[PDB]
Amino acid sequence: RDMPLDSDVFRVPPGYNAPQQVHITQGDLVGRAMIISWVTMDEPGSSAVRYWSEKNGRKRIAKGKMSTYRFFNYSSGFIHHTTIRKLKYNTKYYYEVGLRNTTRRFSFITPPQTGLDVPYTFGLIGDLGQSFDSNTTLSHYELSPKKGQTVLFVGDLSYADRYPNHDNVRWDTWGRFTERSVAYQPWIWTAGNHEIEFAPEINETEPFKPFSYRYHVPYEASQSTSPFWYSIKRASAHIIVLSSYSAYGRGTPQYTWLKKELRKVKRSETPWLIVLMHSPLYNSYNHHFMEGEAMRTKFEAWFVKYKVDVVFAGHVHAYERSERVSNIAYKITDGLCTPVKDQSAPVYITIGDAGNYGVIDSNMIQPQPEYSAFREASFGHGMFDIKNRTHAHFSWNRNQDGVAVEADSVWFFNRHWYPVDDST
Amino acid sequence: RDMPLDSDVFRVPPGYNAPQQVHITQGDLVGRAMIISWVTMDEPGSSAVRYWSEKNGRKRIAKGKMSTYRFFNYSSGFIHHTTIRKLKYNTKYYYEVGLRNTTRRFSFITPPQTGLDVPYTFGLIGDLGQSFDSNTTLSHYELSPKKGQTVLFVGDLSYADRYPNHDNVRWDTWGRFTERSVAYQPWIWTAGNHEIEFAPEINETEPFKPFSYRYHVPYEASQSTSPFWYSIKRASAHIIVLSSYSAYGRGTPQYTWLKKELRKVKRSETPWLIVLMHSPLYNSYNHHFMEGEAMRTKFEAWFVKYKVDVVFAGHVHAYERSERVSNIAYKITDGLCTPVKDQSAPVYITIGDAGNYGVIDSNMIQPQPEYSAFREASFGHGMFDIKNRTHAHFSWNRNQDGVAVEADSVWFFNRHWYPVDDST
Amino acid sequence: RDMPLDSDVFRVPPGYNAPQQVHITQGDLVGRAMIISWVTMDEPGSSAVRYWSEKNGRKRIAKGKMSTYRFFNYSSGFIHHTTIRKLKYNTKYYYEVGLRNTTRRFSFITPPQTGLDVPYTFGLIGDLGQSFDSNTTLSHYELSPKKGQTVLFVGDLSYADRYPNHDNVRWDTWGRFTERSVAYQPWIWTAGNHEIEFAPEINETEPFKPFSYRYHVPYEASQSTSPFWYSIKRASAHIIVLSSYSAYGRGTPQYTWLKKELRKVKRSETPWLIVLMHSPLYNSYNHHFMEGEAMRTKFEAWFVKYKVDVVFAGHVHAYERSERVSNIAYKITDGLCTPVKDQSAPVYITIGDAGNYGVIDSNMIQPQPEYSAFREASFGHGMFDIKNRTHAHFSWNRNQDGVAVEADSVWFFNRHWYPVDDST
Amino acid sequence: RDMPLDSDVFRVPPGYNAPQQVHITQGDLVGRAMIISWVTMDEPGSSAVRYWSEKNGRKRIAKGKMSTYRFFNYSSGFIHHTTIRKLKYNTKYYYEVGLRNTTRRFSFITPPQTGLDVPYTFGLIGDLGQSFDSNTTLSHYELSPKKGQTVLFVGDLSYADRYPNHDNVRWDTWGRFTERSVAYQPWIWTAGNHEIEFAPEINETEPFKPFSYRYHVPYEASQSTSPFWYSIKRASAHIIVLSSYSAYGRGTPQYTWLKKELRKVKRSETPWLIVLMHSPLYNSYNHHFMEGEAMRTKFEAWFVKYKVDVVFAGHVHAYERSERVSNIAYKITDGLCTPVKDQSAPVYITIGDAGNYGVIDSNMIQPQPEYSAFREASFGHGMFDIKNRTHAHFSWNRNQDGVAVEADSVWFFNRHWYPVDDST
Ligand SMILES: *[C@@H]1O[C@H](CO)[C@@H](O)[C@H](O)[C@H]1NC(C)=O
Ligand SMILES: *[C@@H]1O[C@H](CO)[C@@H](O)[C@H](O)[C@H]1NC(C)=O
Ligand SMILES: *[C@@H]1O[C@H](CO)[C@@H](O)[C@H](O)[C@H]1NC(C)=O
Ligand SMILES: *[C@@H]1O[C@H](CO)[C@@H](O)[C@H](O)[C@H]1NC(C)=O
Ligand SMILES: *[C@@H]1O[C@H](CO)[C@@H](O)[C@H](O)[C@H]1NC(C)=O
Ligand SMILES: *[C@@H]1O[C@H](CO)[C@@H](O)[C@H](O)[C@H]1NC(C)=O
Ligand SMILES: *[C@@H]1O[C@H](CO)[C@@H](O)[C@H](O)[C@H]1NC(C)=O
Ligand SMILES: *[C@@H]1O[C@H](CO)[C@@H](O)[C@H](O)[C@H]1NC(C)=O
Ligand SMILES: *[C@@H]1O[C@H](CO)[C@@H](O)[C@H](O)[C@H]1NC(C)=O
Ligand SMILES: *[C@@H]1O[C@H](CO)[C@@H](O)[C@H](O)[C@H]1NC(C)=O
Ligand SMILES: *[C@@H]1O[C@H](CO)[C@@H](O)[C@H](O)[C@H]1NC(C)=O
Ligand SMILES: *[C@@H]1O[C@H](CO)[C@@H](O)[C@H](O)[C@H]1NC(C)=O
Ligand SMILES: *[C@@H]1O[C@H](CO)[C@@H](O)[C@H](O)[C@H]1NC(C)=O
Ligand SMILES: *[C@@H]1O[C@H](CO)[C@@H](O)[C@H](O)[C@H]1NC(C)=O
Ligand SMILES: *[C@@H]1O[C@H](CO)[C@@H](O)[C@H](O)[C@H]1NC(C)=O
Ligand SMILES: *[C@@H]1O[C@H](CO)[C@@H](O)[C@H](O)[C@H]1NC(C)=O
Ligand SMILES: *[C@@H]1O[C@H](CO)[C@@H](O)[C@H](O)[C@H]1NC(C)=O
Ligand SMILES: *[C@@H]1O[C@H](CO)[C@@H](O)[C@H](O)[C@H]1NC(C)=O
Ligand SMILES: *[C@@H]1O[C@H](CO)[C@@H](O)[C@H](O)[C@H]1NC(C)=O
Ligand SMILES: *[C@@H]1O[C@H](CO)[C@@H](O)[C@H](O)[C@H]1NC(C)=O
Ligand SMILES: [Fe+3]
Ligand SMILES: [Fe+3]
Ligand SMILES: [Fe+3]
Ligand SMILES: [Fe+3]
Ligand SMILES: [Zn+2]
Ligand SMILES: [Zn+2]
Ligand SMILES: [Zn+2]
Ligand SMILES: [Zn+2]
């Protein structure tokens, strides 16, 4: 069900050496910087970006960097990444890319300054891929009357690794496909397993190669040493991104980084604390059942201890939302190994159902365990709408329903400023 | 408690640019190759090694490679690594190193061809370090009347990272200290946490740097893509080394590698299957209690499924030997989370008590759980003596006892050729 | 007059990932090693070469290396270079390349052991390019009844740098064009100015990049530190190759290397001493008149001192052969600045007329100076046929004449074993 | 004769990780930027530089870069290079270096904006080295009542290459020795042969390695692609630095660069045109007689054509000043090979007599040829004092004379604004 190469969605912008595959993300810790990235195929081109705010129409120029990579018998085009910094909060900016030959213009809006009661609405997309189903989820998102403002992406971007020799073209088409959204609003990236791409057979053994060339993140903003785990703050939220497929043993860089990072969250500043990861810690579908155990045994207590609000994951191609549950009492022989309701624990949601290559995970653990509050095997996307320092409303819209039909919906009460039972 | 820099044990071989810190390991999959490694400090020197068998006294020459590294305000000398290959099994070889200026001679004996009933005796050392205690354990090993023939090293080599800026000299002194043994019999390396050395503060953020420059392993012999997990066969054993501090998520290179590797073990060929790792899966001391959970949740079933015989670990600075136990029935809600006796399960032994910087882990879990067969907080080393395809005898000698006093002893019955009850 | 891309001469060998652009050169100092190089375009492929002698039909395998490069908006295919060594002198060998997918077979004949009276016939080609004229010179060579056995190539290989952005395809077509000769007999390479390719404008500023990726030479055989100046011995000749466009100041690597090298020539072993370079030291055409002055002032005396026999050059697109002349008496104010006949001096010949992009240099210094013995502005190639330690016969065949019509011809008397006046 | 290691001049600034070997140069094309460089030996340290003008005492900070290198059995400390830019012309600046641990303060004065009649006084030092003689020349310079404001350095900095394995310490001592001057006024660098350091024997074969790590120049300011030839404008002068030991063949990068650069000189803007190079084009001493021939044959005409005023060189350890001479009429056979007076030709001066390792080149060519205006084998330094767009006064002070005794003196009349006869 992968959309064919000629699909209107994969068409290449016309013009000589016209910037294609345009995409953006936050470029700093707090909201006033963006990383613009794109690809030119005819020749190298300029890595300069021109931008100006709607109000103070003064045109400034940011100069970035260019790179390329070869995968097997494949060779990328010219990848560019430029970071515009020191933007003003809450203002619309226009940016142009492809200055030398054919220029293209886009716009984005900086978020509001970080604050306790600042509202903001995030979209949740996981496991997109490029099937027709993928196309549908993306439009439904684009049409959600509750306008999404940033997409928190949970992993498995294009599934190009399913093609022979991981046909990296499929990375190009995906990038062209999603530009309609990412050229305009940032998508926060998380690495999934389809991004690992360990292919000894074709002599490609550096994990995450294509993904890392194409998608950049402000990892040094948090003091991370790798782009696979980082953190950013935006509006009233503090987002922490983790890498299920990187290492988390005690003492490793990721473990060490997260320990420090959790100590840096200030709920008086960013009330909402969200964590993103690919492989779900709590999952009742048969597929990938219990894979999240190892990371679970390692970070769960931290999450309960710092009161994280939600934990979004993907990987299982279906939907599921749990109860605030914890299972942090086991000591091997004491037999205390059963998830228990805990109002300090975060809610674990899994939205890996945006489409992939058109396949859904339907078999599930029967009967629905206690920790599971709702599960459904349908394609869709989610929206996490922050309202106050106390309220945030989550929704799940199915691809079968109309754009405005929330097939599941829930209010979240801030584990810090209003820890009442939302566990309903 | 660490031995002082002037300790006789740290003395530098005399002569201009005299080879120091000499050491060896198996260099191929089956036994007929060695990797000789050493360091010269005055100037680069030759990386050629001259060797000849006692019988056919014809002198041949192997040419290797030289490298250097800088840690913080530290600079290595000239590290050399040369692989002699195509040796004859079961023969004494003499090798000379430092051909240009001051030459030094050593010898080693290739192991017997791999076989079903070929006996061999391994020493077990873990968490050595360089305290006086360390010195002791090493001598006790050197004196075991049951002559050890290869040391399986379980991790934490020198604790140089405990010194300011990880004073890499402590790596040099450790290398000079242990030469008395390693220059003559191979030691199989395993990476522990003291080897990670992630020091962002001094701008050292590439894990395992010093360890990796200094200690090489034949990882491509198994088709591993990293030197932190590999496998070798020697005599009647098939040894598999893993990395607690590397990644093992589903799909990762280490996970992928182990799955394939277990499929390649042939018990009709190497009856004994041993696994090495630093952080113990089963451990009842308070210190580092339950750190091995994550990896446990990922590899335990495979170990039971392939009937691995023993699993040596270190990290807890003390001794402990368990019962053949398994705990692979948990499914979150079914409450089946208690280690059970399983005769397909391997025996988990932890020997991280060779000395470190002179400190013992004594606080235990009271009371001694069922899975724990014997535990003692004493410094010491172990020996695993293979006898037939069915028998192998393990011993633990305390540093307080005399060289020949086995403070713990047990016979192992091959999980494949003689599955009768050991566990006692 | 550049042959069009569809020219039958540029056709690509059929088959999946079929080795194309096959080419060879001597791979050691004395004749018993070859460097096989080729290109595969579909995918990487194997860098193994299979070969066996006609006599002892035992098939052996040599394993080489693979590399790639990008020039501007260009990306090479997979370049391979493999060195077969330890060949037997004077024997025919078959070699196959493209082992994995589509295999191609060729053959070559090792030269005879170096000796005083060993005959051998070299072809002289300079400034080839890929015009139709180039095609003609190459056939005339292929048809010279005096069968050439090795081509000494004087520089300016393909003129791809004349195309926009140095369209490196033109490097591919040239390589395909000349395979008919180079896959079978070695061509010794010399770097000319069309190989420098310094293009700051397109950000290509490393001189000799494409040339160096594609054409390899045994420069370490002589103890050279760069592939732009080296030396080889073959049959009764000792060939020295220099780089007009590299540096030759006093103290530089090239200067230093040549000084030592000249001291290593043994005329009792290789009677004939030949030097190759691109820019001619003695030239009477108007084009490039006096460019060879700087190198001249630096090496001429050495040449006269060691009695080099001939000095072949190219660059001027025409033919010219001089008298044994020297001009090494100048001391600024003494006015002794006029070429004089000297029987210790080498004969300077220029054959840069094989074709280029179809243009000839016709204007010449009028009147023909004394040092010039013969000059003609015609396209052609040359043959230097060694006979004894005393005799060697040089010929120049014009493209207008028939294959067997020597338009100029001369006997050379060895400056060492028979320094009589051949200056006729 | 070289000063001993304990010489007071080689003492190391006290303090932990105290900045040593401090030095500066122009950092842009026109005068408003500086490159501060230094070395810290205890540990890496900060590469930030703090500076503020005397007037507007606002302290700003520039952040630079750190690097290290290894020569043979030698290892550099931590070399730092930071470029302060956008300075105001003609103002005193103070700069501090070593911000983390022990800070040191220095000052410099930006030159006046480029102009037709802007005076400036340059010092001329060549072949300094570190003998006692060297110490002397440096003091004499420091004391010239005609205060020098920038040193144009002609090559051969330290002669470290004379020590075994080119004992790079001699590079450190030289850097500490000269700090007294260079930390305060820029010295413009030129590469000489003692900087090449091609030492195959110890496996060092990349020319100019130590020199290049330690001494940086603003070569991209002119659009040069290498740091061995560049150009800067300062006050009323346009200085062009060349590399005798780099390549200058037709087509090479240096040749190509100079041709374009000469076209960019505007005498209406910087009336005085100076060229620096190591090996002198015109020299009548026996030592190194005629080494400058090759480059001469390549660039002389261009110098006459663009009317360069002076050409300073070193290499011959003595002094010599010529007449405005040219010798650009030779055409091989026309016998016109004798230097002739030419008033468009520059004056060739050689000041390689600052000291070296205490040795003078005294053997001259007898008799003093016509082109030579004055020559003397004494240690000394020079000063080139620009006065107007028409006048500039050059002086040569011997080490034997007193600080104010000009042992040779001459007025230069601008070849462009006042071409009357100087040559006397
Ligand atoms: C390279 O660029 C030129 C124009 O700049 C274009 O016409 C040509 O087709 C390009 N080639 C490639 C391989 O992109
Ligand atoms: C691309 O833009 C540059 C602008 O400097 C122009 O010179 C060139 O001809 C343009 N078009 C193409 C097809 O390269
Ligand atoms: C994808 O969806 C868009 C609208 O959301 C539509 O215009 C387009 O035709 C669709 N393409 C495919 C291949 O489904
Ligand atoms: C690439 O191809 C296969 C992968 O296993 C193997 O035969 C070969 O050695 C690999 N690596 C290289 C460098 O060719
Ligand atoms: C939080 O938002 C909800 C819905 O928008 C509203 O009912 C509630 O009163 C808000 N809380 C505050 C403190 O305004
Ligand atoms: C370098 O080598 C020389 C002898 O080869 C020795 O005398 C000198 O002390 C060495 N220096 C270092 C830093 O090892
Ligand atoms: C080291 O060995 C070489 C052998 O070639 C010798 O030349 C040198 O002098 C020896 N001694 C030292 C101290 O380098
Ligand atoms: C270490 O033990 C050895 C014998 O095993 C002994 O000779 C040596 O003196 C000891 N050194 C220290 C510092 O304990
Ligand atoms: C090294 O020192 C500290 C480590 O956090 C930091 O200030 C600095 O940026 C680090 N990295 C570099 C390249 O200096
Ligand atoms: C195994 O070894 C033990 C002790 O050496 C012995 O009692 C037993 O009989 C041996 N088995 C075989 C098959 O020889
Ligand atoms: C890569 O290789 C596959 C087969 O191995 C081939 O079909 C495909 O077209 C190749 N692509 C390129 C760009 O060479
Ligand atoms: C190429 O050769 C390999 C031989 O191992 C084969 O598997 C493959 O299918 C062949 N053909 C192509 C088009 O790749
Ligand atoms: C090149 O010459 C060959 C024979 O020498 C001929 O078969 C071929 O057609 C010629 N091609 C062109 C383009 O001249
Ligand atoms: C490449 O294009 C031109 C060449 O002069 C220039 O503007 C640009 O800076 C060059 N280099 C890079 C890295 O873009
Ligand atoms: C050299 O060769 C020529 C022509 O082949 C012949 O006339 C002459 O006698 C030969 N010299 C010797 C020594 O055979
Ligand atoms: C490294 O730094 C420490 C202090 O930071 C210093 O005491 C030690 O002596 C230094 N070592 C070297 C080799 O500079
Ligand atoms: C160097 O400076 C730092 C300043 O942060 C200080 O912590 C350190 O102790 C100082 N002294 C030494 C000897 O490193
Ligand atoms: C170098 O000269 C300075 C003054 O110019 C003097 O103070 C110093 O002692 C001299 N040192 C030597 C070693 O000549
Ligand atoms: C370094 O030492 C000598 C220099 O000629 C030589 O024997 C050796 O091959 C050189 N290079 C290396 C990499 O050892
Ligand atoms: C040039 O300077 C000299 C000496 O300072 C002076 O005699 C002459 O008049 C000056 N020229 C101008 C134009 O001021
Ligand atoms: Fe997925
Ligand atoms: Fe330990
Ligand atoms: Fe040419
Ligand atoms: Fe000098
Ligand atoms: Zn997934
Ligand atoms: Zn440990
Ligand atoms: Zn040419
Ligand atoms: Zn010199």
Side-chain angles (χ1 to χ4, degrees), chain A residues 227-269:
Chain A
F228 299 126
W229 58 88
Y230 60 95
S231 159
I232 61 167
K233 301 186 202 158
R234 162 162 291 232
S236 49
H238 190 130
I239 307 167
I240 288 189
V241 185
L242 307 169
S243 175
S244 307
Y245 304 106
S246 262
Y248 38 75
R250 183 152 140 91
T252 56
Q254 188 181 192
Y255 180 100
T256 299
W257 172 83
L258 178 57
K259 197 179 187 184
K260 258 90 161 182
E261 180 70 15
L262 280 171
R263 289 185 225 128
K264 314 204 207 95
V265 181
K266 279 166 65 185
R267 300 276 211 139
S268 19
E269 187 178 290

Side-chain angles (χ1 to χ4, degrees), chain D residues 71-308:
Chain D
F71 193 68
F72 165 68
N73 64 337
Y74 171 82
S75 318
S76 69
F78 310 97
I79 306 172
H80 303 82
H81 292 292
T82 299
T83 308
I84 297 170
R85 48 183 75 268
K86 279 192 263 296
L87 308 180
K88 287 187 69 180
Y89 294 101
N90 209 26
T91 96
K92 194 175 191 186
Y93 277 90
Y94 284 97
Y95 71 89
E96 291 183 302
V97 110
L99 310 189
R100 261 178 80 275
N101 292 98
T102 113
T103 298
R104 289 172 77 211
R105 173 178 300 176
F106 307 88
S107 64
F108 62 70
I109 307 172
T110 47
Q113 186 170 343
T114 322
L116 211 37
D117 291 292
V118 185
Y120 205 81
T121 143
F122 295 96
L124 270 109
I125 311 204
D127 295 74
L128 192 55
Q130 56 196 99
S131 64
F132 292 97
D133 289 300
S134 316
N135 185 31
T136 298
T137 312
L138 192 56
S139 354
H140 268 215
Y141 175 58
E142 303 184 283
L143 307 171
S144 261
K146 345 134 198 165
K147 27 66 270 286
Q149 299 176 93
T150 291
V151 173
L152 301 171
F153 194 91
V154 138
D156 288 4
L157 287 71
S158 63
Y159 293 78
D161 70 323
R162 286 186 68 258
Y163 289 89
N165 308 134
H166 305 213
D167 197 335
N168 277 215
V169 166
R170 282 299 185 165
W171 266 107
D172 292 320
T173 59
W174 194 83
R176 266 180 246 137
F177 159 44
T178 59
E179 192 192 273
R180 75 180 193 248
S181 178
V182 239
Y184 306 98
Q185 75 177 255
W187 283 34
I188 308 311
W189 310 104
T190 302
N193 56 313
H194 282 270
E195 276 72 72
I196 298 168
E197 313 201 56
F198 178 65
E201 346 83 61
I202 50 178
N203 286 283
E204 288 303 327
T205 63
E206 192 226 302
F208 304 112
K209 183 165 137 185
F211 170 62
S212 62
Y213 273 89
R214 299 158 171 283
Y215 296 93
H216 282 204
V217 303
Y219 73 88
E220 292 111 319
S222 359
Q223 294 64 28
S224 175
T225 59
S226 173
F228 304 128
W229 58 90
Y230 57 100
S231 153
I232 59 167
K233 300 186 204 156
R234 163 163 289 232
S236 50
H238 191 130
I239 308 169
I240 287 186
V241 183
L242 307 170
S243 179
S244 306
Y245 303 107
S246 264
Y248 37 81
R250 183 151 138 88
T252 57
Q254 185 181 197
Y255 179 101
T256 296
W257 174 80
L258 181 56
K259 194 184 192 180
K260 257 91 162 181
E261 181 68 14
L262 283 169
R263 291 187 226 127
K264 311 204 209 99
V265 180
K266 281 166 66 186
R267 300 273 212 142
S268 16
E269 183 180 291
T270 46
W272 297 93
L273 175 65
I274 303 167
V275 169
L276 309 178
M277 72 176 67
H278 187 71
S279 208
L281 293 195
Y282 282 90
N283 159 238
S284 59
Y285 286 69
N286 285 272
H287 202 202
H288 302 306
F289 180 58
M290 287 199 297
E291 278 183 21
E293 288 295 284
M295 177 156 57
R296 204 194 96 232
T297 79
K298 235 106 190 73
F299 299 150
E300 182 167 28
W302 294 2
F303 300 163
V304 172
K305 171 180 169 57
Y306 289 89
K307 296 162 145 55
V308 333

Side-chain angles (χ1 to χ4, degrees), chain C residues 262-282:
Chain C
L262 280 171
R263 289 185 225 128
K264 314 204 207 95
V265 181
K266 279 166 65 185
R267 300 276 211 139
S268 19
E269 187 178 290
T270 51
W272 295 97
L273 171 69
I274 304 172
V275 167
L276 305 182
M277 68 177 67
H278 188 65
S279 213
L281 298 189
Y282 280 90

Side-chain angles (χ1 to χ4, degrees), chain A residues 198 205 207 225 245-247 250 252-253 289-291 293-294 297-298 327 330-333 335 337-339 370-371, chain B residues 198 205 207 225 245-247 250 252-253 289-291 293-294 297-298 327 330-333 335 337-339 370-371:
Chain A
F198 180 68
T205 64
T225 56
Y245 304 106
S246 262
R250 183 152 140 91
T252 56
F289 176 60
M290 289 197 301
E291 278 185 21
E293 286 299 286
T297 85
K298 233 115 193 65
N327 176 5
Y330 187 66
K331 303 210 180 303
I332 314 296
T333 51
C337 63
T338 298
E370 334 79 57
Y371 56 81
Chain B
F198 178 65
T205 63
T225 59
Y245 303 107
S246 264
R250 183 151 138 88
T252 57
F289 180 58
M290 287 199 297
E291 278 183 21
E293 288 295 284
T297 79
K298 235 106 190 73
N327 176 3
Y330 185 64
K331 303 209 180 304
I332 313 298
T333 50
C337 62
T338 296
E370 338 77 57
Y371 61 79

Side-chain angles (χ1 to χ4, degrees), chain B residues 3 7-8 132 135 139 142 180:
Chain B
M3 300 179 274
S7 297
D8 54 323
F132 292 97
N135 185 31
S139 354
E142 303 184 283
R180 75 180 193 248

Side-chain angles (χ1 to χ4, degrees), chain B residues 194-249:
Chain B
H194 282 270
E195 276 72 72
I196 298 168
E197 313 201 56
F198 178 65
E201 346 83 61
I202 50 178
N203 286 283
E204 288 303 327
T205 63
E206 192 226 302
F208 304 112
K209 183 165 137 185
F211 170 62
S212 62
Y213 273 89
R214 299 158 171 283
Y215 296 93
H216 282 204
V217 303
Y219 73 88
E220 292 111 319
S222 359
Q223 294 64 28
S224 175
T225 59
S226 173
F228 304 128
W229 58 90
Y230 57 100
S231 153
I232 59 167
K233 300 186 204 156
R234 163 163 289 232
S236 50
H238 191 130
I239 308 169
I240 287 186
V241 183
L242 307 170
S243 179
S244 306
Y245 303 107
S246 264
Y248 37 81

Side-chain angles (χ1 to χ4, degrees), chain C residues 193 196 198 200 205 207 225 244-253 256 282 287-298 327 330-339 369-371, chain D residues 193 196 198 200 205 207 225 244-253 256 282 288-298 315 327 330-339 369-371:
Chain C
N193 53 312
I196 298 166
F198 180 68
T205 64
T225 56
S244 307
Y245 304 106
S246 262
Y248 38 75
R250 183 152 140 91
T252 56
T256 299
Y282 280 90
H287 201 202
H288 303 303
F289 176 60
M290 289 197 301
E291 278 185 21
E293 286 299 286
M295 177 154 55
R296 205 190 99 233
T297 85
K298 233 115 193 65
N327 176 5
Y330 187 66
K331 303 210 180 303
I332 314 296
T333 51
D334 74 344
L336 294 185
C337 63
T338 298
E370 334 79 57
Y371 56 81
Chain D
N193 56 313
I196 298 168
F198 178 65
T205 63
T225 59
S244 306
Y245 303 107
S246 264
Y248 37 81
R250 183 151 138 88
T252 57
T256 296
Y282 282 90
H288 302 306
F289 180 58
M290 287 199 297
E291 278 183 21
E293 288 295 284
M295 177 156 57
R296 204 194 96 232
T297 79
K298 235 106 190 73
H315 203 47
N327 176 3
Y330 185 64
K331 303 209 180 304
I332 313 298
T333 50
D334 72 346
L336 294 185
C337 62
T338 296
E370 338 77 57
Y371 61 79

